[PDB]
Design a protein around this ligand. Structure first.
Ligand SMILES: Nc1ncnc2c1ncn2[C@@H]1O[C@H](COP(=O)(O)OP(=O)(O)NP(=O)(O)O)[C@@H](O)[C@H]1O
Ligand SMILES: Nc1ncnc2c1ncn2[C@@H]1O[C@H](COP(=O)(O)OP(=O)(O)NP(=O)(O)O)[C@@H](O)[C@H]1O
Ligand SMILES: CS(=O)(=O)Nc1ccc(CC(=O)N2CCN(c3ccc(Cl)nn3)CC2)cc1
Ligand SMILES: CS(=O)(=O)Nc1ccc(CC(=O)N2CCN(c3ccc(Cl)nn3)CC2)cc1
Ligand SMILES: [Mg+2]
Ligand SMILES: [Mg+2]
Lengths: 352, 352
């Protein structure tokens, strides 16, 4: 049976697949054509159907897992298309996490004899994050930050060492946001969450701009000026609010200039996309900072797929966390940010 | 000169006016017709021009202030119409607070010989809040809460004693949100703020629904179902997420169902208004709870005009704070919630 780990989220299904590369002569004979067809289908295609994608650049090559050498592959598709995935599977032991492991349990069991083992979505996140950091990204650091995040002429991605990862605040930005405090490999808590997450960005963007993909929303936002929609401190005070250290450029009221009809009539879709992105990202950063101060943790790592191909939000988080914390907190990022739950699920396989 | 206190905010101007009622025979003679015209204009009208309103029900009658007996009146109009107010004034010492005291300083000085004294917006809030609570609301409590906020057959407004008000977390929901920790009458700090405030509600509502007043946005929201727009925990898990105590009804992703085109096509304007209100209010409640836990304060009072005639948001705050804190925090409300800055400014008059 193939070794798969699956994280079925509110928006995306993430799949980690271990392809063995040490297949001996006898093992290849004693393999059923169905298994060979699966392996060849997955390794010879980068798109699967109309909505599945293999993230080839994330592949971990020549990993030793469960005593075998192989390549770890990372695959995603929308949860909306899980019926297609299951139907293909109908025409093995599955470690699955995320809410969909529960919601679609009965659907997975329409696959004859399949054994479904549900694992907790935050247990899997912590286990997968710690594992990937431990084995490295093909010899490169899994974890990085933006050095000198306050000056754009200097700001650059740089590696960060997590050899002693504890304590750690993990901010998981998916459909919503979950915030975890990790104190040891077996001691962690869900501190809180917020419902202003990636699904809010995409949902509001679609309502406001008519965009029909995450990537299109980001492209619009890169062209926009959020200050056309937001009311800034300087719009209220005429400058800084000096007494409490609020600079004139800080947002006082997100979308607050949209209470004026003439401003609603002149704002562009790109401006509204950028204001949505800035609003969601700043709120996540601020909640992360408050949790970090309360948990007495100074390293904050952001994961989840809201940040995939989203350098705007990563740089905003890096700058905002550093600026508003007076340098006490650092925003950390991970190359495999969307996939840790799926890896953690795969790692649960020996228990079954 | 008339005794006025003014708070010029990003959205509304709030004015407190002390009308003396112990005017002797000689004082009435030695009063200039301009002053008499002002007093009669203010006390004989409840609407001023097209956008000014006197909140008659908030009037404090027979208050002793600066050694005189009088009535304290509460008046509001949009900051957008401040040019009209100043032009009327051109055709006295003014204690003014809010950002507009700085932004419009030069405009106020077009009134000949007028002495403008700028006072800090959060100093004035604390002073005015403590003062009004101290003198009472015409013998009734200024402060109230919703008793048994978890059961609607029981939930009812009840008075709350703030005789020993410290410590206190003050959540000021205006255009944006400011959060204050008040430890004594002269010891308080701005803990943080969020830009997801009343201006976000009104701005997003106008973009999404075409409403053109705060009151119309609230009326739409009262008719809506926010779960048509929001993705809930049960939409992701099929039920509760038991492991971390998340009930199926909790919002996992605000507007998160709007990533689906078919759902964007069936949602009503009333549903979007309600989802906007719920999103903003829950985020404010959650930020308040985190600040309360970090400041080690268990009494949280909400002020500002986002909550005027807004019982939906007050009940949501009351319920959410009690539910998510496991009963450790209580949401408190104040009858004069929008006007404390203007009163605090008026109270600064003896210093000039
Ligand atoms: N191709 C995409 N399609 C949809 N959303 C995308 C895509 N790429 C990036 N995103 C963003 O990724 C977010 C979902 O991130 P993800 O970490 O996969 O969440 P999830 O696990 O499916 N949700 P959750 O149940 O809350 O844990 C979406 O809300 C988008 O903001
Ligand atoms: N008649 C109204 N017109 C406009 N907004 C109203 C009205 N009534 C209630 N509101 C709400 O009141 C909020 C403004 O509250 P308010 O406490 O007066 O803020 P402000 O002081 O003007 N802003 P700030 O500069 O941030 O302190 C608006 O964002 C609305 O959500
Ligand atoms: C695991 S998931 O897949 O279902 N995703 C997921 C599920 C839920 C959430 C939101 C969350 O965690 N909430 C809700 C908000 N909340 C409040 C609200 C008002 C107050 Cl006063 N206090 N707290 C705290 C708890 C985020 C993401
Ligand atoms: C006094 S006013 O009239 O001008 N109104 C007013 C002014 C400003 C604000 C927002 C605020 O206080 N902010 C900004 C957000 N912020 C962040 C952001 C990212 C991170 Cl990582 N951390 N913190 C904290 C500080 C609210 C209301
Ligand atoms: Mg997830
Ligand atoms: Mg104000």
């Amino acid at each position: 049976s193939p070794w798969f780990g699956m994280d079925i989220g509110g928006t995306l299904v993430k799949l980690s697949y271990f392809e063995p590369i040490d297949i001996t002569a006898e093992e290849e004979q004693e393999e059923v054509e169905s298994l060979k067809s699966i392996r060849k289908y997955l390794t010879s295609n980068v798109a699967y159907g109309s909505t599945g994608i293999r993230d080839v650049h994330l592949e971990l090559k020549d990993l030793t897992l469960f005593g075998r050498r192989g390549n770890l592959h990372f695959i995603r598709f929308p949860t909306q298309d899980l019926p297609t995935f299951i139907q293909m599977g109908r025409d093995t032991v599955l470690c699955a996490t995320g809410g969909g492991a529960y919601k679609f349990e009965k659907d997975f069991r329409t696959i004859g004899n399949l054994h479904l083992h549900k694992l907790d979505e935050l247990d899997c996140l912590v286990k997968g994050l710690l594992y990937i950091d431990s084995v490295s990204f093909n010899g490169q650091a899994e974890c990085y930050y933006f050095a000198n995040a306050s000056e754009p002429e200097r700001c650059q991605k740089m590696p960060f060492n997590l050899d002693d990862p504890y304590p750690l605040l993990v901010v998981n930005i998916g459909s919503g946001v979950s915030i975890l405090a990790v104190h040891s490999k077996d001691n962690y808590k869900r501190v809180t969450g917020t419902s202003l997450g990636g699904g809010t960005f995409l949902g509001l963007c679609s309502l406001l701009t008519g965009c029909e993909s995450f990537e299109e929303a980001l492209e619009m936002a890169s062209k926009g000026d959020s200050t056309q929609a937001d009311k800034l401190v300087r719009d209220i005070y005429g400058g800084d609010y000096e007494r409490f250290g609020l600079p004139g450029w800080a947002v006082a009221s997100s979308f607050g200039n949209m209470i004026y009809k003439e401003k609603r009539e002149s704002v562009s879709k790109e401006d509204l996309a950028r204001a949505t992105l800035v609003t969601i990202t700043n709120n996540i950063g601020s909640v992360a900072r408050m949790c970090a101060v309360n948990e007495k943790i100074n390293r904050v790592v952001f994961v989840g797929n809201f940040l995939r191909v989203n350098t705007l939000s990563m740089k905003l988080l890096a700058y905002a966390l550093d600026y508003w914390s007076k340098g006490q907190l650092k925003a950390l990022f991970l190359e495999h940010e969307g996939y840790f739950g799926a890896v953690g699920a795969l790692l649960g396989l020996p228990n079954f």
